[PDB]
Amino acid sequence: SGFWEEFESLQKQEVKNLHQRLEGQRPENKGKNRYKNILPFDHSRVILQGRDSNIPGSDYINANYIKNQLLGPDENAKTYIASQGCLEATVNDFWQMAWQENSRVIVMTTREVEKCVPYWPEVGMQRAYGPYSVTNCGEHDTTEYKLRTLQVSPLDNGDLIREIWHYQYLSWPDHGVPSEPGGVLSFLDQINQRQESLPHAGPIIVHSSAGIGRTGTIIVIDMLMENISTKGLDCDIDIQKTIQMVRAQRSGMVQTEAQYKFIYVAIAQFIETTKKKLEV
């Protein structure tokens, strides 16, 4: 009865039975997914532009638009893409997405591993990725994270130059979360300020290996921070509802027990810090 109540609640939250993931399941796209069971919902997937529909799977990337649906359209919420990240086979696809979406801020929640391969050149260097040139115009590190200032242009028009700020979290442990949330809160603060300075900017791209665990954690924390900042400390904070709201847009967002608890820890610290600054 307790069990059956809880089971009923879980059944009502089930979305993988409601929304198809045809595109990610295509055999033509097998090499474009890290995991065959971590796929974008068709309804919210990012569709790559300029692709030939006669080439099976050509428009596919393992990424979804994520909207903060707890803020109204009048409340100036930031928008996100939750993406699989740093997969060597899809690096050109990633930059196509970044360009077409007009994204000016990219958030990477992993260090390199060797599989997570860099998709930027070294400082002062320039590299081609499909139709695009990327130049690394500087790297600015803290203890916990790194800002790389990128400039991107089409190969066919070098006058068009676009600044992209690449934020890479360096301190996130393998198979766990940061011991304290201050680093992530600081990181998100910088990210938010950057995005706010660019009113024309497209969505913030957030990625991790699978694009659901760390990615979902970062996005949910950011959304809750935005909700508190926008609506105030008197506002109702419902983390479970927020997670369910993002999971309807990409399955499995916030994957682990440690991530789930971390969201509470981070938001508790954010509230307390805020109150200390308000002298409240």
Output the DSSP codes for the chain. Answer: -HHHHHHHHHHHH--TTTS--HHHH-GGGGGG-SSTT----GGGEEEPSS--TTSTTTTEEEEEEEE-TTS-TTS---EEEEEE---GGGHHHHHHHHHHTT--EEEE----B--B---SPPTT-EEEETTEEEEEEEEEE-SSEEEEEEEEEETT-TT--EEEEEEEE--PPTTS--SSSHHHHHHHHHHHHHHHT-TT--PEEEEESSSSHHHHHHHHHHHHHHHHHHH-TTS---HHHHHHHHHTTSTTSS-SHHHHHHHHHHHHHHHHHHHHHHT-
Structural resolution in Å? 1.8
Q: Which among 106, 112, 80, 110 is positioned nearest to 94, based on CA atoms?
A: 106
Handedness of CA 74, 264, 237, 268 (dihedral sign): negative
Of the CA atoms within 13 Å of residue 125, those in its CB half-sphere come to 7
Cβ atoms of 82 and 203 closer than 8 Å: no
| Start-to-end CA span in the chain (Å) | 43
| Cβ count within 10 A of residue 28 | 12
Place of tokens 């979305």: 15
Q: Which technique was used to obtain these atomic coordinates?
A: X-ray
Q: Please state which CATH number belongs to domain 2-279.
A: 3.90.190.10
Give 224's contacts (C-beta < 8 A, 6+ positions apart).
Answer: 237, 239, 242, 263, 267, 270
Place of tokens 């935005």: 226
Cβ atoms of 64 and 47 closer than 8 Å: no
* Distance of alpha carbon 242 from alpha carbon 248, whole angstroms: 10
If you compute the radius of gyration of the chain from its CA atoms, what whole number of angstroms results? 19
Q: Where are the domains of the chain?
A: 2-279
* Distance of alpha carbon 280 from alpha carbon 159, whole angstroms: 51
Structure tokens at 168: 């890479």
The Cα-based distances of 184 to 97, 105, 142 in angstroms read 25, 16, 12
Q: Which among 91, 92, 69 is positioned nearest to 79, based on CA atoms?
A: 69
